[PDB]
Structures are given as C-alpha cells and as structure tokens.
Design an enzyme around this catalytic site. Structure first.
Site, PDB file in Angstrom:
ATOM      1  N   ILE A  16      -4.060  -6.037   9.029  1.00 57.96           N
ATOM      2  CA  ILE A  16      -3.181  -5.057   8.406  1.00 57.96           C
ATOM      3  C   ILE A  16      -3.990  -4.493   7.249  1.00 57.96           C
ATOM      4  O   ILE A  16      -4.190  -5.156   6.224  1.00 57.96           O
ATOM      5  CB  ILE A  16      -1.843  -5.658   7.962  1.00 57.96           C
ATOM      6  CG1 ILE A  16      -1.007  -5.968   9.216  1.00 57.96           C
ATOM      7  CG2 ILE A  16      -1.100  -4.698   7.047  1.00 57.96           C
ATOM      8  CD1 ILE A  16       0.231  -6.816   8.973  1.00 57.96           C
ATOM      9  N   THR A  70       0.819  -1.209   0.000  1.00 58.35           N
ATOM     10  CA  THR A  70       0.000   0.000   0.000  1.00 58.35           C
ATOM     11  C   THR A  70       0.856   1.262   0.000  1.00 58.35           C
ATOM     12  O   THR A  70       0.407   2.317  -0.464  1.00 58.35           O
ATOM     13  CB  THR A  70      -0.947  -0.043   1.209  1.00 58.35           C
ATOM     14  OG1 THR A  70      -1.668  -1.279   1.191  1.00 58.35           O
ATOM     15  CG2 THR A  70      -1.948   1.112   1.183  1.00 58.35           C
ATOM     16  N   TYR A 100       4.014 -12.784   5.066  1.00 61.85           N
ATOM     17  CA  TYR A 100       2.967 -12.122   4.294  1.00 61.85           C
ATOM     18  C   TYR A 100       2.744 -12.925   3.021  1.00 61.85           C
ATOM     19  O   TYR A 100       3.622 -12.983   2.152  1.00 61.85           O
ATOM     20  CB  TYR A 100       3.348 -10.671   4.005  1.00 61.85           C
ATOM     21  CG  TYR A 100       2.388  -9.871   3.147  1.00 61.85           C
ATOM     22  CD1 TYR A 100       1.081 -10.289   2.923  1.00 61.85           C
ATOM     23  CD2 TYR A 100       2.803  -8.684   2.567  1.00 61.85           C
ATOM     24  CE1 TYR A 100       0.219  -9.539   2.124  1.00 61.85           C
ATOM     25  CE2 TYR A 100       1.958  -7.935   1.777  1.00 61.85           C
ATOM     26  CZ  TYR A 100       0.673  -8.363   1.559  1.00 61.85           C
ATOM     27  OH  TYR A 100      -0.158  -7.600   0.772  1.00 61.85           O
TER      28      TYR A 100
END
Ligand SMILES: [Mg+2]
Ligand SMILES: [Mg+2]
Ligand SMILES: [Mg+2]
Ligand SMILES: [Mg+2]
Lengths: 296, 296, 296, 304
Positions: free
Chosen positions: D213, D54, D143
């Site tokens: 998240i 992001t 992740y």
C-alpha cells in the site's frame, strides 16, 4: 576486492576453571568446519572479547588458524577497539598470526563522530593487507557507522570490503546495496538472515550457528543460489531459537545452549557476564528440543 | 558511609605532540581548586579514558592527588571497565596511588544483566576500602543499572555510596531518592544540574566546569544551601553552553572550548576522537562569548 | 497575559450503561473543589476525549462550568484536534459554554511540521479571547512541539500562555523556562510534578489528583509558596501510586482506582479502552492501601 | 472459535495506492480525484485506498469521507481494481460506523488503522478489531503504524485476530521492523502481510508479503506495479532492481511528514493543479521543495 563471505560463525570461547579451554576451542571449530561453515570469527562479541587478555586473543586466533589449515574455511579475526592505536595493533597481530581477514567493531563507549570513524577505519585498513569487514552494532557501541561513512570507507580503502550489520534496519540494508552494490553486506542478526541475504547480502556472521551450524550453512547457501523458498523455510523454522538466544545478552544464551547440548564442559563466563536466570535456563532448553543438534 | 559529594569536574586530558601534557594537567587542576571545586575526576569519559594507556591513567591520577594534597579538594578517580577483573585491578590501582574514591562506569559493550552488574560492582567494592560511586550512562554503555540494582548495591556494599546519572531521566532520579534517600545522587548531565540537585541530589560531576568552574561550583553550593532561586538562575544562564558542549560527542566540544579560551595549548585528541566540524567549531566559539571565563 | 495555573485535575468521565453519568461527574468535580484544586480539565486525555461525541463534550464542559460557579475554581476545557478547523470549532464551543480557558493537544496521528503547528495554534488562539494552554505529549500524538515553536507562539499570540508537558524531558523544561521565563510551564506527568515545579513551573494537570486531590493540591501549593522541602516530601510519598497509575495506558488505572475506592459505581470504559489485566487490577489495589483516599 | 486460519478468506492484495486527496479552494477537487484514480487504474495498480493517512483522513469531514469513497467505487467499476477504503478511528463505535458505511457504499474491503492517541492495550485492540470485523462481511486489513498512533498491534494480537475473526486477513506494516515481518509469517504464514513503507517493499515481498500500500505509486504507479508483480512471480532480480532504483524517491517522499512531499511531487509533475493542504498540514520548506524537485529528475513520470 579480496572478500570473506558465506556462512560464518561468531565463535563462543569455552572456559575451564577460569582459563580458555584450548582443546574444546579447537574441537568446536572442527565441528563448524565439518558442518558446512565457510569462515570462523574468533574473539568477537560472542567470544567475550571484552574480558579476554591480549594473550588469550592471540591463543584463540592461533588455534583457529591452525585448525582451518588445509581446508577452505577462512579465519576472520575479531580485532576492534575503542582506541584506534589498539585496534591497529590488534589488526597487525591478527595478520601476523595468519588470519585471513579481520572483523573490526565500531568503537564502543567513546562515541566517535563519522569523521572520527572514517579516520579510525582508514588507519586500521592501512595497517594490514588482508580484507577488513566493518561491524556496526549501535545497541552495544552507542554509535552508528552511517551508510555514507561505510560507503566512503569501502570506496576509499582497498581492503575494506563490506559491513556486518546488527542494527535491525532493513531500510539501511537497502540503502547500502542500492548505492554501493559492490560491497559485501553481512547479516549480524540471525533472525533476519534471510531478508538480508535475499536483498543481495552475501553472508552471515551467526550466533545460532554455534549450535546449529548445518542449518545456518544451508540457509546461507540456498540464499546465495537464489533458492529463496528453501532459504526462507529454514529462516522461518529457526526464528524461535534465533530469538530465544537473545532472551539475555549474547553470549549468555548461546553458551547456555552449548552447555545444555553437551558441546562444552562448563557453563563458565567471565564477569560481568554470568549464568542466566533459572527461568531462562529452562526456556532455552525447551526451545532447543525442537531442533536437530549435530554432535562432534 | 564515607562520601565524596559537591561540585566536581570530569577533567579533560590535554595532549601535547601525542603525549599527556603533565604541566598543563596540573595547571588546570590548580585552576579548578582556585574556583571553589570540591573534587576532581581524573581519567573519566571526559578525560578520554578509553584511549589512554594504563601508565597514562597512573600519571593522571598521581598528578591529581599531588596537586590536591593539602587543599581539601578530593580526587575521585575514574576506574571502570567492561571486564570485572580489569575494573577490580584499576580500583586497587587508584587506591594505591592515593585517590580518595573511585568513579566506576557500568560495563560498556558487553551488556551485562542486572545480576551481572551486581556481581561486577560487588567485586569492585570488596577490593578497596575507599568510597565507590556508580556511573550510569546507557547512551554510551548500552546497559542500564536499574534503580533496584543501584539500591541493592548501596545497601549491600559498605563502600558504594551513590550513583552519577547520565540518563536524561528525572523520573528515575525521583525513584532513586524516594526509595533510598540516604544515597548520594550525582548529576552527570550539566544541563539538568539544578533539577537533580533540587530533588536532593548532592553534587555534580561536570563537563562545563572545565571551562566555567566558578559558575558550576556556585550553582551546586547555592543548591546544597537551599537557595534554589540562585541555583536555578545559574543553571538557566548556563543552558546554552551546557548544550553546545554536546553538539558533538563529549569531550570534543569541551576540549575545543578550552583551546579557544587559551586554557590548553593544542586542540589534540586521540583517535577515534578528532576535531569538530568547522561549523560546530564556529558555534562553540560563538556561545562561549556570552560567558566570563576565568583565566589561570 | 491572562493565565490559568495551580493545581489542576484532568477529570475522568464516568460512564453508566455506556452513557456519561452526569450526576457522578458533577459529584466528582465537587470533590475536587472541596480538596484544594484550582482548576479542572473536562474532556482531556484522562476524560476519554477520543471516544466521546461532540454532544458529550458539551455536556461535560457545561457540568464543569456549572459546578464551579460560586468558587475560585477555573474550567480549562479540553479542546484539541488533529484538524485545525475542528480545534477552532471546539475552542469557540468551549468559550461559548463558559469555559475559563482551553487546553489544546498537539495534533495527533498526522504529524504536522513545526510550521504547521505554528499555524494550527495561531488559528485556535485567534478564534477566542480566553487563555490557551498548549499540550505536548509526543508518546501519544507522534509529534513534538519544539521549544522554539512554543516560545514563538507564546510571544506572537496574546492568548497562548504556556504549555502542559508530558514528555519525560526535564532538559526541555529547563530549555523552555531559560529562554522564555514568562511562560507558564505545567506538569503533565504526576511522578515528576515536583521537579517541574521546582524549576519554575506554575502548576500541574494531574491524573493522580482524581484519587488524591488533597495531596496533589498541597504539593503544588507548597511548591508555589517556595516550600520546596514540603512539596518534595509529598512528591516522594506519591511516587508509588504515581507510577502504578500508568501500569496500563491512562486512564485505565485511574478509573480502576476510583472504582476500587468506591468513587464511581462501575468500572466502565469505552472501547478500545477496557478493564486492566487481573494482575494489574491487583497491583493497583495493593498500592492504594498505603494512601488515605478522601471520600465525598 | 479460534480456527478461522485456513477457512476461506476474501483478500485484497497486489500493488495498491494510498490515494492523495486533492483540494481546490479548500474543497475536495472531485474531478481531479476521479482523474487521478483513472491514472492509477491505467498503470497496473490492483487496488486503491481512499481516505487513508496519505489522503489526509484526519482533516476530512464525514461527508468528504463519503464522497471520496463513492468516487473511488464509481471509478473502479468495470475494472479489476479493488477499493480498500480507509475506515479506522480511535473510537471503536466510530470505526464500526465507518466500516459499515464503506460496505454500504460498495467498497471491496477496509483498511483499519490501529487507534491513535488513546493507546489501547493489546486486549483493547483485540476487542476493537473484533467489533469492526463482526460489523461487516467484507475483508478487513489491519494497519500498524506506531510512529503515528502511539501503539503497536503485537504479532500475537495480529495472529489472534486472524485466527479468531472470519474477515480479518492480514496487516499493513509501517513499522521499520523486518524482524516482526519474519515473526508474523513464520508463525502464521496464511496471513497477507502488506508493505506500508515503500523503501522496503522488496524485502517485505521477498519474505512472502503479498502486496504494498504505496505512497510512491501516486507518482510512479507503473514502477510500483511492476515491482510488485515481478515479486509475486518470484522474479526477485527484477523486483529488487526496481526497489533499488526507487530508493532515492522513496526516501525523499518522507523528508517531511507524508503526504507533504508526495503532494509536492504531484504538483511539480503537473498532476494536481494546486499545492493545497488542510491545516495543520502545509507546504514543505523551500529547501525540501527543491530537494524533492531534484530527486524527481531521475524518474520517468507518467502523465494522464
Ligand atoms: Mg549451488
Ligand atoms: Mg568546597
Ligand atoms: Mg506473470
Ligand atoms: Mg535478489
């Protein structure tokens, strides 16, 4: 809306010498009733609906209706087809035979558009006055009933009350109940029974419950009471068997497990279904040994 | 092996007031014969096999056989089912009604294992003495006939001579003909007709040829004669219409196109199929105008 | 447009004690030149571009340029990045070091839109005056350069002359050359080299040619000469090795094969790449024994 | 050894924000970046993730990677809010370097995305993360985002890494796979499963996940924080009510590739001065720009 919810079982269809074993069928339904199950689904996917004759469809539905009389257990009859005229006929027959509602799979193989799915289910819903649950399983049918189409059918057709989802798509499960919270979302995927129920789903139509009806019943009723700790504990314990029951296409593993537990007399399928491989036969048996299997 | 190859058409089934338009059906087959087509496929997917009655299957096969008699154009009848016992019956039925061979789709919805597919097709092949072409279309059926299973069936069963592939998988097409170059690989996806033929495929079973039979037959015959430049030229020219004919599920666009071209009287489907959206109706009509459509 | 086409090799990068083995690299490129290859691609995917330093990028490109001096063999340098500013820098870099053109992979991981891809490649093309080949590999990048975007870039930017496709999508290959027959479509998937070339593709950027450069160069040159029969023969013979070279992520198998054939001294990767499983190591060794591997 | 599962692991959980990286005339707007993190802190967020997906990590320089982590650490000093620094790479040697960097500049832990583009095997992923985890003594959150990387960290590999490495404590999942979420916590309930997909925050938390998240929390930090803390207290009604209310914005923020919509939304709300991306990212289509603007009207967007 009249609804059929709670812990429900997609019944296997036992065969004996190539015919439906009607005594075994009744005995299996009685075992479901006595282990906390709220409804039974005759002649769905797990019941090998695709290879049964129409006379065998009627026989199975009649046995289910007769066996559930005098109990709270409902009969949610499988009554779907790739052809709308046949699905309408099967719905009317199920109603005539005393079924409490119908489970109607999305048309397989011919891939109707969303407009076609809407007209398909509208015709089915208008043909009977009993509850109708949609059934979305794109891995088998080749099409998807979109969230918008499910919601329009729920809002436009009085007796359509929800959907059984077998799509591995918890995002869609959120989408459905966030935009139309009055519908009954039903889990058609045992491994994720608890996540669907904890988002406001109101039942399951289970494969695993053929073998472990008490455990699936307890999971569902814990969840409906918002006892999520206890419901998740059962869902976690069941993950191994929930997955091994799809090591080959359902209902090959669940019929194998029922045979391995002595709950059916013969490991018979109708072609193109057939026995599992020797290696998967052994894998199913080994996973079963970790679970407490109720008898008759 | 006895084979049926070349340029073939998956015939649409025109309806008039909800019934098979038998005169239109014969008239459309005559038009195929007069534009170089080598075989016709009654009551396949494009012919809405899923919503026709067994009597309508017989009617279509009988019209196909009678119209092609004395013309050397062969009849490759659709005769598949999710149930082996039904698929066997339909195969014998097609042979009885005079079909030259059968096209038998992989079982839809119930997802047989590779072992089950083998037993399924072995039973079908043993029930008749006419050629049998397998049909793999996983996007519709939910299962895939693996290259190994196709090759075993080809080698083990006298009547099984190849496969119609509708899988968007040119790698698999190489796999098939590299390991078993004697089989007849048939294109079931119009947009990639030329790549399949130029790798040694020996025919097509076409949707587009309903509308443009002269162009599809020339493409196939150019390719079989190893004039790859001219075969590719037609395949390239056809790409736009080949794609727009699947903007909605086949046969929704092709029936729309045949209606727009004046080749059928009414734009009628059987539910759950239905007319396309207004926008796709417009897109189909616009793409058609770039092509010369043969009349009757 | 200036073009770089024909038989091309995506060069492996040999390591010795964790460093680029500059002597082995030059020797391997000479082996490609002497076995009919038309161009070499240093520091592409097969060359472990993701784990090389910018200085090692320079070293490999310079060695490629130097080794090709005095021959017709071109250097099509890998010079792509997820960041446009870096891709521009690497392009100018490659031109500065004497490369004949650049291969520029679609941005990985950050999933740009089609508008972003257009602006990305426009910036790269305007930064140099040498040919630029687009490279589409959605299984690795997470994005797809659409046909429309490829065609717009080809028509709007002088230096962009085609696309290397590794997308398992022969439909798109038809789409590309049907709407823009002037572009150079290059196969990036060895197993389907022949189908792409027979549809008008003009070259390959090969993994297999690392091991079997003579066979890949011969296949490509037969196809470019319209000897499609002889090109297909080689493509069919190579299918087994073409498939086993991707039993694990490329370049794990091709480096294993080069080690097994004695063409590199050590089976060294840079993490996160690593040796194959023992089972896959054995499968690669067995498949190789059906092929004649040229030495130095 | 293989028995780290019940030994003490430092964790970073709760409501966490994948910070956008604002640009001004092509450079990182450092004053805006600090102001945005302050706004997250003041609206109940438990940790911030600088220079993740992001945050346009792919187009930032190494020096800009540095600056952003340093601003995050400095802004969070004196608060409970943790800094879980983005520190992943397709190259193991670089991922190790970024991990050590984050530790040496004061990050509380690292978020380490699976290698993109080069598609390592499960064995390669295991060796990749073992090297990263052994290079620092701060917590490491895996992740998994296969739609972007082209690879998947399997449940068995995640669990092996949790059991074999002291500092690996869980995984951020962005995989649309609630079955895998059950698989993970049924077989290894000691790990911290973190939601990486806003629309399904509540289902992941209600199965025992311990944080999010979030992309949406850039715009609506108070709502994502409230959702997460309700769920952690087992107030599943209240958590689901917010998850349902957020579905429309949660989906529209991915009508184009993240972070194109969230930066568009932050600009429309007046929280950033210019709608600037670094190529190959760019402004959304005019149609999606309008759709984002319309979805926003349902929500109460906190200012500064
Ligand atoms: Mg109670
Ligand atoms: Mg002929
Ligand atoms: Mg509290
Ligand atoms: Mg709740």
């Amino acid at each position: 809306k009249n609804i059929i919810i709670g812990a429900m079982t997609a019944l296997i269809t036992p065969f004996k010498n190539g015919k439906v074993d009607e005594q075994s069928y009744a005995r299996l339904i009685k075992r479901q009733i006595e282990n906390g199950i709220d409804a039974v689904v005759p002649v769905g996917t797990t019941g090998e609906s695709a290879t049964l004759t129409h006379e065998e469809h009627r026989t199975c539905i009649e046995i289910a209706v007769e066996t559930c009389k005098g109990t709270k257990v409902k009969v949610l009859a499988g009554a779907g087809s790739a052809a709308t005229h046949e699905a309408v006929g099967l719905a009317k027959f199920a109603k005539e035979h005393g079924a409490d509602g119908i489970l109607s799979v999305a048309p397989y193989y011919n891939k109707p558009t969303q407009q076609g799915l809407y007209e398909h289910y509208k015709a089915i819903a208008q043909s009977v006055d009993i509850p109708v649950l949609l059934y979305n399983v794109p891995g088998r049918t080749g099409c998807e009933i979109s969230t918008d189409t499910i919601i329009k059918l729920f809002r436009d057709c009085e007796n359509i009350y929800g959907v059984k989802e077998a799509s591995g798509n918890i995002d869609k499960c959120v989408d459905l109940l966030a935009h139309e919270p009055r519908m009954m979302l039903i889990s058609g995927e045992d491994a994720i029974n608890y996540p669907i129920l904890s988002n406001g789903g109101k039942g399951v139509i289970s494969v695993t419950s053929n073998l472990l009806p008490d455990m699936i019943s307890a999971l569902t009723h814990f969840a409906l009471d918002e006892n999520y700790k206890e419901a998740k504990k059962i869902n976690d314990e069941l993950y191994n068997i929930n997955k091994i029951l799809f090591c080959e296409s359902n209902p090959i593993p669940i019929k194998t497990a029922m045979y391995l537990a002595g709950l059916i007399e013969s490991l018979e399928f109708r072609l193109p279904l057939c026995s599992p491989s020797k290696e998967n036969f052994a894998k199913i048996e080994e996973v079963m040994k970790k679970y407490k299997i109720k008898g008759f």
